[PDB]
Every structure is written in C-alpha cells, then in structure tokens.
C-alpha cells in the first residue's frame, strides 16, 4: 500500500523567491507517474506531470528518472502572488482510457508575501 505524504500543510514565501512543495511516496507500487495540481475537483490546474506536458517553471528536487526514487518534491521559481493556492501531490496508475488517479496527498497551501 503506497501513501502520498506532503509533510508541509502550508508554506509562506516572498514574491520572487522559490516555492518548494515537498512530497514523498512510501512504495513504488503501483507503477505510474506523479502529477501536481493546484486545487482539486474537475477544474483543477495541472502544475506538473513527469511524463508529458510543458512546465518550464517547475524543477524536481530529486532525479525522478531513478527507478527507486520516492521523492516527488518540486520547486516553482519566481513566485508571484498569483501562485497562491493549495497544491496536491497525486500518484497516478495505468488504466483506461488514460492514466487514472490512484492517491492524492492532503495538500500544501502556498501563500505569498507581495513586494
């Protein structure tokens, strides 16, 4: 049984700084990619997807290409007040018709101090 753990309930950064959203998985099973979202539900915003998508503001804390990697923390650079919100670390599994969400973290609230 894999768990998605976000050790930070909330985070405060200044505008222009970097936001580090921490997330660790407890298992490699099941196989599947990790995705980051801002918000939950149907209209949630895709923040990161390790297999497809354009996310030039996001860098991974660790090397996700390593087979035994379980750190899925990301860094969002040049934070502005518009980046404030709740970010969820989500584990996906292989399914039909596309990848299917397996488990989501409890979320990390990002708040920003403006300039």
């Amino acid at each position, epitope marked *: 049984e894999l768990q998605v753990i976000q050790p930070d309930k909330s985070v405060l950064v200044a505008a222009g700084e970097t936001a580090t959203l921490r997330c660790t998985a407890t298992s490699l099973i099941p196989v599947g990619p990790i995705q980051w979202f801002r918000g939950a539900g149907p209209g*949630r*915003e895709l923040i990161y997807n390790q*297999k*497809e998508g*354009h996310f030039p503001r996001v860098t991974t804390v660790s090397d*996700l290409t390593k087979r035994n990697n379980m750190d899925f923390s990301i860094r969002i650079g040049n934070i502005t007040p518009a980046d404030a919100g709740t970010y969820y670390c989500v584990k996906f599994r*292989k399914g039909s018709p*596309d990848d299917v969400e397996f488990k989501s973290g409890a979320g990390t609230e990002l708040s920003v101090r403006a300039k």
Partner: antibody
Amino acid sequence: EVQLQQSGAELVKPGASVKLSCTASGFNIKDYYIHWVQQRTEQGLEWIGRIDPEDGETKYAPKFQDKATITADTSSNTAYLHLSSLTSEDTAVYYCARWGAYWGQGTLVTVSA
Amino acid sequence: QIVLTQSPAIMSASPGEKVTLTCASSSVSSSYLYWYQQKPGSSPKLWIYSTSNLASGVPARFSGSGSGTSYSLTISSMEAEDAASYFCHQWSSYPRTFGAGTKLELKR
C-alpha cells in the same frame, strides 16, 4: 538540447504497410511519453497515440486503433509507428513528439500505386 | 472527442493591428489548452501553454485568454514574422484534439 529526428519520406502502395522511425537525443525516451501525430492537407492535426517506453504501454485514438501500432526501443532511444492497410486517405505528414514543445521534423507518407 | 472550432479559418491584419483568434470547444476544457504556431515546411511550435503562458522565445506581444468552452489568442501589434497558422489544442479530454487552425496573413 532536445531533438527528435524522424526517418525519410516513404512511398507505400495502397494496402501495404510502413514503419516510421523517430530517434531522440538530449534525453532518454524512457522518461517521457512519446506521441505520434498526423497532419493531412485537408484535415488538420490529429493525435494518433502515445507510448510509455518504460513499460511499453500504448494508447491510441479510436480512429487509428486497428490502423496504427506504436512501439519503442529504449536501447536505441527510438520510437516507431507502424501503419497497416494504408489507403489514399492515409497520405499525410506524420510527426513525432514529446508532448509540449518537442517535435520531430515530420515524415511524408504517400500512398499511391 | 472534443471539437475545437477556429473561426475564421483565414484572416488578415495590418502591421500594428491588434488581432484576436478564437477557439470554441464542443465541451469544456481546462488548463490543458495549448496554442501551436506552424509555418509552411516546419514542425508545429508550442506558442502558448496553459491558456495564457507564453513559451520561451515567444514575443511579449502575444497573450492568451479563455476558460470553459471558448478561448482566444491575441497579438497586440501584428508583425511580419507573426504570419503563420495557429492551432488551438486540448488534452484534458481523451483523445486530445486540435482545431482546424486559423491562417494569419500580414496585410501589407
């Protein structure tokens, strides 16, 4: 730098088959989904499918299901697109893509007797 | 699959003219909406991602907007190098689809 190099133009007789190639550099295809797109002069861009080269899982648009077969080889860092029973409606430019901003230069496939 | 209707399919704008390209969806789409610029003889280039964010190298005169079932691409001041075909793209619903595209010419 990321780059996708596709195979040369192909001429296929109607009813026959062809396998297109796509070799990547600057990254390992094992780490990303590799997509295939076709573009016809009168039907625009159409997503054919993708493959996860890490486990070989393939997805397809229902239009190209029995028509397209996508394979990948992590050793040679190359993805392949096999097309069967090619009709004149399959004459198009076929693109290789790591989804987002990384595309191949395209491969012309003319289906004519 | 989602129908992305780009109308008009061909339009013209003079240098310095503000131009807006529209993309209407048969069903709702989310931040999976990309815009691709394509010129003859070249691959599609990612231009706008996640509705309003410019890809690297895209001039600041470009901007994107929209939500739900209607989106837009806008050039504040038309330039000659902006003459191309622009396709809107969604990949929030399976399978991912493209619009038929709007060809944009410069009115010299």
